[PDB]
């Protein structure tokens, strides 16, 4: 016994202690605490069956025990929800000795299940009597601490939670002590210290329960520490999913774009809360906030009930950021007119944000007007588009996209307009701007005699800050392919050009397998290499990938007429004619 | 984007997730009893033995 | 100016240039590079 109880003090040689106790039964099983010390070892190995097997032998004999063998009986009955037996064991423990603490605190936790039912007997009889018979008991100190938290006594919780921390030495108890001091200073907004308490609470005993993990994760919202918030909140879902633990990962949305590790879980939480309603308000906002990459109709539906949800709690006008974005959705839909109405009422609601230069409704109106001018371009109301664009540029000339959509509008008229000059001054205001810089050479695509000169005007932002630029390097491939179909291939010149375009296409192949204009380029150059049976297959791939590429319609029918498959070709020619572009495209009928 | 409040604070509260937790009793790692074969100076095994009705219904494992 | 960072922060881009070129399905290029090597086997 001396060496077996020596083992439990140090947390090791525990099966050795059980063996030396079982050495007692094979030398002298003449009294029960010889085998009850086996059962506490079994209990601490989470074997409550092996505990209670020896624990049946306690109460049949009941040696001289003021220490209440029935106390541990009830605690095993606390395990695996044998509660009614736990109550009866703690009761008879109190009848043998009401002075003992374990029975009263056991029933205190036992009635911690019902707080709204039987509050007072938990608070005073179940707890304050345990505080009376021992004011140094870190259980009852922790429980009066969390009661005082819920009773909003934030003073004496910090009187006695420190002692509840120091008087205990096991990790989970001092984890709960740090956690409770952390929740105390959290609602007291002393978050720097309470953060440390949350981290210590997690670090002491982690597998116990997940509230310290939640405390750290929400504490990482303080001080911008939110990277570990996601990692720590993952264990909350590893604990068990709840409505609570959706919104933390939803609002803490490191999912920006093409990042499914935060985005698929965002989808799961969003359809964890969409069916729910724990006073859902913004739940549809962060629904649609990821839906803009995805299906647009889901975003529409989210905004639809989101428009409603701002009206019932108070008849509050929808903020114009919502209304601008739903008009932006309808822009890529057929709902162009009510998209315009959305932008109008967006600008009005921004005007109704009369005093909100913190939120900068003026800047929101700037981008809203940008969207509305882009819409007027879709109306082909280029007059009012000019008006809105020059209104913004006369008030924010630092902006570039309005500066070049104007240029694009005159590009529709032609190249050497102020189209080309707005484009060049967009580089003058911002030479770092890759979109405008690409559009510079896009102008030069009109001048194909400026073919070999485009190496320089597509080299300027081949600086590696801009690299990798798939769009530009495919433009290099395209200006390199227009070099072909010349009588100099036999002179190995266009063969070198074919292989150089092939090298560009291999490069864009390796850096992107899923580009389709690339594969169109490979198939085109090998078709120029005379491999047309080797071309319809590679074009078939981009054909299922997306039919809505005007080029591949032509290039497939070129193969068809190369097998003289006219009755497969001209139909797909006029299928290419089903776009609203030009009633007689010339090269297509050629 | 929407200007979301930074939710650095709990007011719902998590109390549904909190009081659902039933709290362990680990005051003494051998389950709140001094384990001793010397302090039983007394024994009820002598005449007469004592066994309350609550004590018989705790002598069962699960018989309800 | 403050308007520049003021707008480019609060807006969002869901539609760029580069992922137009990339296909919305999953069309890998091993099949493409396999036939690329296969035509080289005719070479």
Per the entry, the structure determination technique was cryo-EM
What subunits make at least 3 CB pairs under 8 angstroms with A?
A: B, C
How many A/B residue pairs have CB atoms within 8 Å? 161
Mutate to test the interface with C, among B1, B2, B4 (most CBs of C within 10 A): B1
User: With contacts defined as CB-CB under 8 Å, which chain B residues touch A322?
Assistant: 2
User: With contacts defined as CB-CB under 8 Å, which chain C residues touch B1?
Assistant: 10-12
- φ/ψ (deg, to 5) at B43: -155, 130
Residue matched to tokens 């006073």: A279
- φ/ψ (deg, to 5) at A418: -70, -10
Q: How far is residue A446 from each of residues A27, A412, A451, A461, A479, measured CA to CA in Å? A: 103, 12, 10, 20, 11
- CB-CB under 8 Å, A509 with C29: yes
Residues 1-40 of B with CB under 8 A from C: 1
SS3 at position A192: helix
Q: What is the SS3 string spanning B1-64?
A: CCCCCCCCCCCCCCHHHHHCCCCCCCCCCCCCCCCCCCCCCCECCCCCCCCCHHHHCCCCCCCC
Q: How far apart are CA A229 and CA A242, in angstroms?
A: 17
CB C15 within 8 A of CB A468: no
User: With contacts defined as CB-CB under 8 Å, which chain C residues touch A499?
Assistant: none
CA A480 to chain CA centroid, Å, is 42
Q: A71 touching B, CB under 8 A? A: yes
Q: A530 touching B, CB under 8 A? A: no
Q: How far apart are CA A449 and CA A172, in angstroms?
A: 78
Residues in contact with A430: Cβ distance below 8 Å, sequence separation at least 6, in sequence order: A400, A436
**Other beta carbons within 10 Å of A430:** 17
DSSP A80: G
Q: How are the residues of chain A apportioned to helix, strand and coil, as percentages rounded to the nearest 5?
A: 70, 0, 30
- φ/ψ (deg, to 5) at C22: -65, 140
- The reported resolution of this PDB entry, expressed in Å, is 3.0
Mutate to test the interface with A, among C9, C15, C23 (most CBs of A within 10 A): C23
User: With contacts defined as CB-CB under 8 Å, which chain B residues touch A105?
Assistant: 25, 27
Residue matched to tokens 């020896």: A54
Q: How far apart are CA A272 and CA A221, in angstroms?
A: 22
Residues 147-186 of A with CB under 8 A from B: 150, 170, 172-173, 176, 183, 186
Residue (of A224, A216, A177, A211) closest to A196 by Cα position: A216
Kindly report the CA angle at A540 between A534 and A541, in degrees rounded to 5? 105
User: With contacts defined as CB-CB under 8 Å, which chain A residues touch B1?
Assistant: 289, 321
């Amino acid at each position: 016994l001396g060496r077996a109880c020596f083992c439990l003090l140090e947390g090791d040689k525990m099966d050795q202690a059980d063996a030396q106790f079982h050495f007692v039964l094979n030398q002298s099983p003449n009294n029960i605490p010889a085998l009850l010390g086996k059962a506490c070892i079994s209990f601490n190995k989470k074997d409550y069956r092996g505990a209670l097997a020896y624990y049946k032998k306690a109460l049949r004999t009941n040696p001289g025990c003021p220490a209440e063998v029935r106390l541990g009986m009830g605690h095993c009955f606390v395990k695996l929800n044998k509660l009614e037996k736990a109550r009866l064991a703690f009761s008879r423990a109190l009848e043998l000795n009401s002075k003992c603490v374990g029975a009263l605190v056991g029933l205190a936790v036992l009635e911690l299940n019902n707080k709204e039912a039987d509050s007072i007997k938990n608070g005073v009889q179940l707890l304050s009597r345990a505080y009376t018979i021992d004011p140094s008991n870190p259980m009852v100190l922790n429980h009066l601490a969390n009661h005082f938290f819920f009773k909003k006594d934030y003073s004496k919780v910090q009187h006695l939670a420190l002692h509840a921390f120091h008087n205990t030495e096991v990790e989970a108890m001092q984890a709960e002590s740090c956690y409770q001091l952390a929740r105390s200073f959290h609602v007291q907004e002393d978050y720097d210290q309470a953060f440390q308490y949350y981290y210590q609470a997690t670090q002491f005993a982690s597998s116990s329960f997940v509230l310290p993990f939640f405390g750290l994760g929400q504490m990482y919202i303080y001080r911008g520490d939110k990277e570990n918030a996601s990692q720590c909140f993952e264990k909350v879902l590893k604990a068990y999913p709840n409505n609570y633990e959706t919104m933390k990962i939803l609002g803490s949305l490191y999912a920006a774009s093409e990042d499914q590790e935060k985005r698929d879980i965002a989808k799961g939480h969003l359809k964890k809360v969409t069916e729910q309603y724990p006073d859902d308000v913004e739940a549809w906002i962060e629904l649609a906030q990821i839906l803009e990459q995805t299906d647009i109709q889901g975003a529409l539906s989210a905004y639809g009930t989101a428009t409603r949800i701002l009206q019932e709690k108070v008849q509050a006008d929808v903020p114009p950021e919502i209304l601008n974005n739903v008009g932006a959705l309808h822009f890529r839909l057929g709902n162009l007119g009510e998209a315009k109405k959305y932008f109008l009422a967006s600008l009005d609601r921004a005007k109704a944000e009369a005093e909100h230069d913190e939120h900068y409704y003026n800047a929101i109106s700037v981008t809203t007007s940008y969207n509305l001018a882009r819409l007027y371009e879709a109306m082909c109301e280029f007059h009012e588009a000019e008006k809105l664009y020059k209104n913004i540029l006369r008030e924010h000339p630092n902006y570039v996209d309005c500066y070049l959509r104007l240029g694009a509008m005159a590009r529709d008229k032609g190249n050497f307009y102020e189209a080309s000059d707005w484009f060049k001054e967009a580089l003058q205001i911002n030479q770092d701007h890759p979109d405008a810089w690409s559009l510079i050479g896009n102008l030069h695509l009109a001048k194909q005699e400026w073919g070999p000169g485009q190496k320089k005007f597509e080299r300027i932002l081949k600086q590696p800050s801009t690299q990798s630029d798939t769009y530009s390097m495919l433009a290099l491939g395209n200006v390199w392919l227009q070099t072909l179909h010349q009588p100099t291939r036999d002179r190995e010149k266009e063969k070198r050009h074919q292989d150089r375009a092939l090298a560009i296409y291999k490069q864009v192949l390796r850096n992107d397998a899923k580009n389709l204009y690339a594969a169109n380029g490979i198939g085109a150059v090998l078709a120029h290499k005379g491999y047309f049976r080797e071309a319809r297959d590679v074009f078939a791939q981009v054909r299922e990938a997306t039919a809505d590429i005007s080029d591949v319609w032509l290039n497939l029918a070129h193969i068809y007429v190369e097998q003289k498959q006219y009755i497969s070709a001209v139909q797909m020619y006029e299928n290419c004619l089903r776009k609203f572009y030009k009633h007689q495209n010339t090269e297509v009928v050629l | 984007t929407y200007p979301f409040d930074q939710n650095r604070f709990v007011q719902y509260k998590a109390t549904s997730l909190e009081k659902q937790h039933k709290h362990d009793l680990l005051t003494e790692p051998d389950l709140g009893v001094t384990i001793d074969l010397i302090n039983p100076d007394t024994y009820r095994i002598d005449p007469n033995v004592l066994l309350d009705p609550a004590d018989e219904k705790l002598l069962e494992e699960e018989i309800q | 100016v403050d308007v520049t960072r003021d707008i480019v922060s609060r807006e969002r881009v869901w539609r760029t240039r580069t992922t137009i070129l990339q296909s919305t399905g999953k069309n890998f290029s091993k099949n493409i590079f396999a036939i690329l090597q296969s035509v080289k086997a005719r070479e």
